[PDB]
Amino acid sequence: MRRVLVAGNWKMHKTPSEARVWFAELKRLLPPLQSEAAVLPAFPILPVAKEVLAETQVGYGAQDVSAHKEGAYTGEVSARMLSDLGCRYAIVGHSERRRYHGETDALVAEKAKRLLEEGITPILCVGEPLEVREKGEAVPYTLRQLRGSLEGVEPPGPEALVIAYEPVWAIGTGKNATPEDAEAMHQAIRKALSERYGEAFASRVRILYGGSVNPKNFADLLSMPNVDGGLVGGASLELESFLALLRIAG
Amino acid sequence: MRRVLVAGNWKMHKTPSEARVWFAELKRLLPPLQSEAAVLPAFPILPVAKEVLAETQVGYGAQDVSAHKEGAYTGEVSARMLSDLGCRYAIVGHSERRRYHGETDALVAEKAKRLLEEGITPILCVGEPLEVREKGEAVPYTLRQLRGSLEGVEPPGPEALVIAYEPVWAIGTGKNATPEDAEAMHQAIRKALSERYGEAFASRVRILYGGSVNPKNFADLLSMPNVDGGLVGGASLELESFLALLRIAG
Numbered sequence: 001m002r003r004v005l006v007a008g009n010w011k012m013h014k015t016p017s018e019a020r021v022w023f024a025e026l027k028r029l030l031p032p033l034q035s036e037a038a039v040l041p042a043f044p045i046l047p048v049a050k051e052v053l054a055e056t057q058v059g060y061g062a063q064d065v066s067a068h069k070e071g072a073y074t075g076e077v078s079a080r081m082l083s084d085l086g087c088r089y090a091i092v093g094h095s096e097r098r099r100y101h102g103e104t105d106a107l108v109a110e111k112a113k114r115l116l117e118e119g120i121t122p123i124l125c126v127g128e129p130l131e132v133r134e135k136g137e138a139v140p141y142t143l144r145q146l147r148g149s150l151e152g153v154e155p156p157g158p159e160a161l162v163i164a165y166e167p168v169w170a171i172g173t174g175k176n177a178t179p180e181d182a183e184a185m186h187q188a189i190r191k192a193l194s195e196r197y198g199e200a201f202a203s204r205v206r207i208l209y210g211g212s213v214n215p216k217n218f219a220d221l222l223s224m225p226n227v228d229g230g231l232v233g234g235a236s237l238e239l240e241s242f243l244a245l246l247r248i249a250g
Numbered sequence: 251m252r253r254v255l256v257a258g259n260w261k262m263h264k265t266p267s268e269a270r271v272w273f274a275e276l277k278r279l280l281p282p283l284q285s286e287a288a289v290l291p292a293f294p295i296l297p298v299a300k301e302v303l304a305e306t307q308v309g310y311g312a313q314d315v316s317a318h319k320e321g322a323y324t325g326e327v328s329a330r331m332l333s334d335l336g337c338r339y340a341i342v343g344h345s346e347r348r349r350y351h352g353e354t355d356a357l358v359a360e361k362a363k364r365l366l367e368e369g370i371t372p373i374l375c376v377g378e379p380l381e382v383r384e385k386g387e388a389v390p391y392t393l394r395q396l397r398g399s400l401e402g403v404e405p406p407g408p409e410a411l412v413i414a415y416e417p418v419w420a421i422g423t424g425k426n427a428t429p430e431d432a433e434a435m436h437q438a439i440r441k442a443l444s445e446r447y448g449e450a451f452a453s454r455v456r457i458l459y460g461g462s463v464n465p466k467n468f469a470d471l472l473s474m475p476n477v478d479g480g481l482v483g484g485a486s487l488e489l490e491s492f493l494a495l496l497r498i499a500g
């Protein structure tokens with residue numbers, strides 16, 4: 001069975017000083033767990049994440065990364081910077097960046113390649129907008145996004161790639177996809193991965209569900225055969241909530 | 251007179267571990283100077299900048315910042331995060347972001363506002379492309395960018411705002427604007443600032459020149475009455491080069 005992954009996307013919240021406290025509390029309170037936990041804070045919080053969590057079972061990663069290895073790209077952060085900090089993951093193609101920053105499938109693929117080269121696992125996000133869902137095109141749209149975002153992306157193994165299905169209409173709206181609909185989409189995604197990398201590879205890739213995941217609905221979502229964890233937004237900000245999610249994962 | 255400012259924009263280079271060494275060497279080799287020095291590294295390098303440069307005369311800052319205070323903006327860094335780290339500055343509207351990230355004057359204005367609220371000084375970049383310069387419209391174009399980028403931007407005082415004039419054609423091309431052309435542009439910019447904030451304010455605002463600034467041309471650029479320092483790109487990557495620029499500033 002695929003090991004569960006609970007990744008907390010703090011988005012643009014907290015300061016480095018506030019994060020130090022949060023991480024220290026998590027370290028002291030963290031019980032022994034079989035599943036995998038990871039926190040994905042803003043760029044300037046990564047150093048303290050490394051400092052406080054490096055020796056714990058809790059991993060960490062970035063919320064974005066440059067499509068370039070280095071250069072005249074003011075404001076951008078490179079994969080080499082992230083690997084120097086020991087990031088295990090980095091989100092690429094999050095809905096918010098595809099929407100607010102015009103990130104294309106092609107750009108997301110490049111970012112994924114930069115991460116792979118440095119041994120960082122991309123958490124590649126795909127998901128359809130409400131309009132597409134209502135027209136009954138959720139699966140074709142999401143698969144098209146997945147294939148486009150994986151163009152030229154060839155991970156060393158299934159452990160080096162994570163896919164996160166986050167329907168846009170489920171982000172911060174309180175309206176999560178039902179476990180059944182999530183399961184159906186993950187099945188489609190996994191089949192697409194099998195065609196892309198082979199069955200052995202696809203059967204081992206962790207596919208997380210994201211979009212209003214919380215302590216009240218996580219257990220049922222995680223019970224779905226093809227749902228391997230969650231990309232948690234709002235519910236990862238409060239330590240008690242994050243811990244509750246980790247206990248559910250076990 | 252206006253205190254000179256030499257700000258090094260490393261763009262996307264180095265790692266936190268490499269920066270720790272660089273900053274520590276700068277700290278040990280830094281001679282007493284009248285002018286102000288600042289280094290602007292990538293986001294994840296800011297914590298070590300704070301650690302090593304805290305007690306020194308060298309300031310530091312970011313290369314970008316979110317237009318929002320906080321929220322669901324995956325990948326973005328807030329002004330509050332930068333304030334927590336003691337950043338004195340943050341670049342906004344760098345030509346690379348206006349081009350590669352489609353940043354508009356309106357967006358840049360919001361970023362500047364976020365910085366002001368947190369007591370961080372924006373280093374607002376404005377500049378024209380080669381064809382505009384050749385058409386003899388460098389000033390009108392640049393002033394329009396300045397005015398749009400300062401919409402709703404009301405600093406507490408002139409010490410809280412820095413303008414950087416960087417001709418797009420002078421970035422990484424090796425061809426810096428002549429001291430005469432830079433002076434002419436800075437005069438136009440300062441006059442615009444006077445109409446916007448009054449003469450007392452405008453006469454105290456530091457207007458830096460950027461675009462292929464190096465040890466060979468910095469002295470003459472700095473000699474111009476309205477050029478108050480430089481936003482240094484490639485020439486700020488090597489410590490010896492940065493130190494040379496600081497010695498020139500005095």
Ligand code: NA
Nearest residue numbers: 222223224227
């Ligand atoms: Na499951």
Ligand code: NA
Nearest residue numbers: 472473474477
């Ligand atoms: Na001068």
